[PDB]
């Protein structure tokens, strides 16, 4: 590897970086180094070139592509190394940036006018309840609305009038309404409980007129008259001139505001709100010290009076203005040019040369990567990102362990921690034992990286470790919940960090089908927000349903419409890149996405069907599923075994179902040597982690290394009874599976856990589908709702899987890929597709995906909750002693193959099952006994 490093630096920051860059490369003179070094040498040079201080101006070239660029060095657009760069390059009708500046400046000088009431003064001094009857943002909104109703609010002297209690402060003037919504929602968004309003309201002001004081601001309301008697000590020199210059800025630019569309207004006001909380939290974090008394805004850690309200308003204004400037004029730090990506894929990765069919100069890209598992999907996503140049992306993945797997792939192929940042925000205690030096695994949290210039506008220089890893990451391999808060939050400033993260970075969401329906709705909201700033969305899901692919394209198309009309460019359409392991297709799609997507789906189906059938599923006829499991285990051991040893996966639905199947199979008298494992999610930290590592090392069938992790000498049935934790994110390879039916994507995923690593075709049948789910004996009205898309609004007419599924069927992604809306009441696949198009629709609703008008409100974050689960309290095992109503028990010790013990950790119990003892056990975790 031959690199060349050039320095642009002034100071002796052309000198103390010269020591480190002259420790690793030869000096060719004139502050230019050039030579041969290894990739780990590149990583070491990066780590000790960035850590040496601020102001390092370093460009590295590997062959002729830029390896890395330290700082905001413009470096190369076409040629490299410019001459002098001075000022005044373009200076356009910027319009919408002047609009955002005027809105943020006018609102930020009015965002805390409502702290001047006597209640907030005695709240800061501390002789009343610290919770206000009406929040000060609403009081400042009442001030601004009363001033606007009285005088002309855009060109007049200010003077705060006598204000009363107003239920609504939103009128008709679109720009005033924007300023009012920025003022009122500078801490939290208003929440609308009204069902008719949630049913009908769509527009900007027409929804904003329904935002009343009862949506969170009106806490208790007994001291309203003191909350609206206000002093007017803000009339000073610099506050009045700042208010005048920003109001006239808005006055001069609001003529382009009425030429915007609804989508524009929503996205622009979201940006304005994010910059306003950025400036407000930035000025509230630091201590300024000086004060002019008689009025105060915030308190220090000692509770003393600080940050008087005139200079508080001025500081929040300038900090929000500077926030806006750096978030709207940033050339963000991108990743290194990974040299182990750009070469050809060989063999089964040979489809990854589809990036040589995509244009490298497209400003936008919507990848739908429909490639099957085991083909290197995430490597292909990184290849697609690097085809357009240097990489800046957020790999948002479900589960901690899947982020760990993608991080380990990124580490061992070409990516160091100067470009990658693995973020899992829980600090799990799963450590690697055996040998620390001989590990060559366990990707960790260090991020030598490079701190971006956006950290100076965040509160108190961003944060410590976690938010520095969030914001400053070129490549952010993260759990997805660090990105879905970009679309907005209920309370606080947790929106700004993923918002500013997704503003300048691409978004790569892998296996989006494993998320929930509301989770997929907020993920497509994130896709729309990412496309709002021209970034590229890579979706990587093999079993995509047309509905999902369509609504994600429509979210990207609305976002790219926002980005196109935001830079005053005519919208040519979205560069959609359909991708699988058999080919690629790049089309400029502005309309008719459905026929092209279904034609690619049909081409992928015909490229999947002439291949040999790997998963032949038979739906059993035996009604009782206990003895159906027995007979199917006996049949698939007598048919599918490797010299007497067979691996079976009993995929069931819920935990007590799993322990019921386990306790039946343990007490089942047979000549077969059944060896039973329980693989559900309710387990203690230690025990769970141990199951994972063992299962990953015994079900690895790409080699014969497993022969030494199990007793393959004696003919044995190694059976793993598992819940849907096996069908998501597990690289497992079973000889056969017996599936309790809950949804068709569960069938396709548990087919993907059988012969995942081998290529031998089954002869007779490798999957035995149960006749009924076990909830049929508990609830015959609805049985597929647990881990399925059946529900109270979408009920199957019959629950028989002979009626709702094929008796003999080759299970692949084809049934999920096709998409059928008719006959959803008597087939599982059409039931699935129905729900997917009836929840992820092209409407705005309130819990929908095109959400417009409601982004202003708190409604999409309350009624569409990301990871909406049950109450979930956590019973914690502390050194062998349980906390709550747990009561350790003893398992049946009949056929347990492996049982790992646990002493620490915690189990997640729903509040429903907290009533009784969860009865934790070493073999199977939680049950009802």
């Amino acid at each position: 590897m031959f690199i060349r490093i050039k320095c642009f630096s002034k100071q002796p920051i052309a000198k103390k970086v010269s020591r480190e860059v002259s420790a690793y490369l030869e000096y060719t003179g004139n502050n230019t180094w050039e030579g041969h070094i290894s990739g780990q040498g590149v990583s070491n040079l990066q780590t000790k070139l960035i850590n040496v201080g601020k102001g390092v101006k370093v460009v590295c070239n590997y062959q002729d592509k830029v390896l890395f660029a330290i700082g905001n060095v413009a470096m190369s657009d076409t040629g490299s190394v410019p001459k002098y760069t001075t000022k005044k390059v373009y200076k356009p009708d910027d319009s919408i940036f002047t609009l955002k500046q005027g809105l943020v400046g006018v609102a930020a000088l009015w965002h805390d006018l409502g702290k001047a009431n006597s209640y907030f003064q005695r709240k800061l001094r501390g002789e009343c309840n610290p919770s206000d009857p009406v929040r000060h943002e609403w009081v400042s909104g009442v001030i601004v609305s009363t001033f606007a109703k009285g005088n002309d609010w855009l060109s007049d002297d200010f003077i705060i009038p006598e204000v009363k209690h107003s239920d609504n402060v939103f009128g008709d003037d679109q720009v005033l309404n924007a300023v009012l919504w920025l003022i009122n929602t500078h801490h939290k968004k208003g929440l609308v409980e009204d069902p008719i309003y949630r049913a009908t309201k769509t527009m900007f002001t027409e929804t904003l007129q329904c935002v009343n004081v009862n949506g969170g601001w009106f806490n208790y309301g007994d001291n309203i008259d003191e909350c609206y008697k206000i002093d007017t000590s803000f009339i000073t020199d610099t506050y009045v001139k700042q208010l005048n210059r920003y109001r006239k800025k808005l006055l001069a630019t609001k003529h382009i505001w009425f030429t915007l569309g609804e989508d524009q207004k929503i996205a622009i006001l979201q940006e304005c709100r994010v910059a306003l909380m950025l400036g407000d939290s930035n000025f509230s974090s630091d201590l300024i010290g000086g004060d002019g008394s008689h009025l105060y805004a915030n308190l220090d850690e000692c509770g003393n009076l600080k940050q008087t309200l005139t200079q508080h308003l001025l500081g929040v204004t300038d900090c929000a203005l500077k926030a806006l400037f750096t978030i709207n004029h940033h050339k963000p730090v991108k990743a290194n040019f990974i040299p182990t990506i750009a070469e050809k894929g060989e063999g089964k990765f040979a489809w990854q040369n589809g990036v040589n069919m995509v244009d490298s100069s497209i400003d936008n890209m919507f990848c739908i990567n429909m490639a099957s598992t085991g083909k290197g999907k995430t490597l292909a996503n990184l290849k697609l990102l690097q085809h357009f140049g240097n990489v800046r992306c957020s790999f948002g993945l479900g589960m901690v362990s899947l982020t760990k797997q993608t991080a380990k792939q990124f580490l061992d192929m070409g990516v160091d921690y100067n470009s990658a940042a693995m973020v899992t925000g829980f600090s799990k205690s799963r450590f690697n034992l055996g040998s620390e030096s001989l590990d060559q695994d366990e990707v960790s949290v260090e991020y030598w990286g490079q701190t971006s210039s956006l950290s100076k506008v965040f509160p108190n220089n961003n944060a410590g470790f976690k938010n520095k890893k969030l914001l400053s990451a070129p490549i952010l391999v993260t759990t997805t919940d660090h990105l879905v808060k970009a679309s907005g939050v209920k309370k606080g400033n947790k929106q700004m960090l993923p918002y500013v993260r997704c503003m300048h970075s691409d978004l790569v969401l892998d296996e989006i089908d494993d998320y929930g329906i509301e989770d997929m709705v907020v993920l497509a909201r994130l896709v729309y927000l990412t496309a709002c700033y021209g970034n590229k969305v890579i979706i990587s899901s093999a079993t995509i349903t047309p509905a999902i692919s369509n609504i994600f394209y429509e979210a990207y198309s609305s976002g790219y419409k926002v980005f196109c009309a935001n830079k005053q460019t005519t919208y040519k359409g979205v560069n959609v890149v359909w991708w699988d392991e058999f080919g690629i297709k790049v089309e400029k799609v502005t309309d008719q996405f459905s026929n092209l997507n279904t034609r690619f789906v049909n081409k992928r189906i015909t490229n999947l069907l002439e291949s040999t059938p790997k998963h032949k599923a038979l739906v059993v006829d035996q009604d009782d599923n206990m003895e159906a499991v027995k007979q199917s285990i006996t049949t698939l051991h007598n048919a599918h075994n490797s010299g007497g040893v067979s691996f079976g996966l009993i995929r069931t639905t819920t935990i007590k179902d799993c322990v019921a199947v386990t306790q039946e199979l343990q007490n089942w008298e047979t000549d077969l040597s059944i060896k039973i494992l329980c693989y559900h999610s309710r387990f203690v930290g230690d025990t769970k982690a141990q199951m994972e590592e063992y299962l990953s090392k015994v079900l690895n069938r790409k080699g014969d290394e497993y022969k030494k992790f199990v007793d393959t000498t004696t003919p044995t049935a190694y059976i793993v009874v598992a819940t849907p934790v096996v069908e998501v994110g597990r690289d497992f390879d079973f000889d056969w599976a017996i599936i309790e039916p809950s949804s068709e994507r569960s069938i396709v995923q548990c087919a993907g856990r059988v012969l995942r690593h081998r290529s031998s075709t089954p002869t007779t049948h490798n999957i035995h589908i149960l006749k009924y789910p076990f909830k049929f004996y508990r609830n015959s009205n609805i049985c597929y709702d647990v881990a399925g898309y059946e529900s109270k609004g979408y009920k199957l007419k019959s629950k028989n899987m002979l009626d709702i599924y094929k008796k003999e069927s080759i299970v692949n992604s084809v049934n999920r890929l096709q998409g059928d809306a008719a006959f959803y009441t008597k087939s599982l696949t059409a039931l699935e597709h129905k729900v997917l198009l009836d929840k992820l629709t092209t409407d705005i609703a309130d819990t929908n995906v095109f959400v417009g008008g409601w982004q202003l409100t708190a409604n999409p974050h309350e009624y569409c909750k990301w990871r909406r689960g049950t109450k979930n309290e956590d019973l914690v095992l502390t050194d062998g002693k349980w906390s709550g109503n747990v009561t350790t028990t003893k398992p049946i010790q009949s056929k347990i193959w492996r049982k790992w013990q646990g002493e620490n950790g915690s189990i997640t119990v729903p509040e429903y099952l907290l009533d009784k003892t969860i009865c934790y056990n070493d073999f199977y975790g939680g049950y009802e006994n």
Binding site: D64, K65, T78, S80, K87, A342, D359, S361, N575, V586
Partner: protein, 295 residues
Amino acid sequence: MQKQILTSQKRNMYILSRCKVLVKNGQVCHLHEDGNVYTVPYANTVFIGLAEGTSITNEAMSMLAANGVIVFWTKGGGYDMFAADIICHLPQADYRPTKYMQNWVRLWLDEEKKLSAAKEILKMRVDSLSTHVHDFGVDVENKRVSSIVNKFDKGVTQATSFESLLGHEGTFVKSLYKEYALEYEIEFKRDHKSADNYNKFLTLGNYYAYGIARSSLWALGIDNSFPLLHGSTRRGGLVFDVADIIKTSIILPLAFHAADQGMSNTEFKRSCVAYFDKNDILAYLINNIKRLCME
């Protein structure tokens, strides 16, 4: 004032994209829309090109023309199949050598002489293939390429009309483009309005070969307005004969290799510089028009 650098040994080669081209403090440079000023070596530049969002000034154009740098503008194509119109500023203030234009005129006006020159220039692409052999892509001396160029030479030998030359031209272009497609295992259709990298690399090489051809013609004073091959499809001037002498020998395998390896456009610019410089393709074209003119 010295020898002013002869055109065939001029080496630098650019197509400038999204930058206003100006002069700072003596030298011609281009300033992009981020503040970056990159200097142009105008004394050694063969041609510059101007893509979308480009803007050159007067004294910059003067310093290119008086030094002898042919300047064109890449956009202008508006049809569905053809690279329609490329606008090209000739440095005519340098008074050109004359008798090569007289020889080109005496072969252009005589119809049987134009046909004879049409013949030799059609086999000139055949010998271009034989001389300029790349290390990658196809091998020229395989059975399929030799069979098709043998059929091409046999058909162009017995040709007697320019429409027969246009038909045989079409079969030659279809034969090569598709054989390269086969080698690189892709499906190929030549559309100038396509997002596929094998196509816009071919249009970038069209612009590169256009610039090379006007520098070769201007170095001998030959105008583009004397097309020895003409037709309804083939209406671009003499640049659409001295530019596509070197498609299937230089540009099209280089475009397919660049679209197969798949980095950005700048490696293709630099690869065109490297192959036009190492094998001296400009001097090769000039010397071929030299042995054309005096025969």
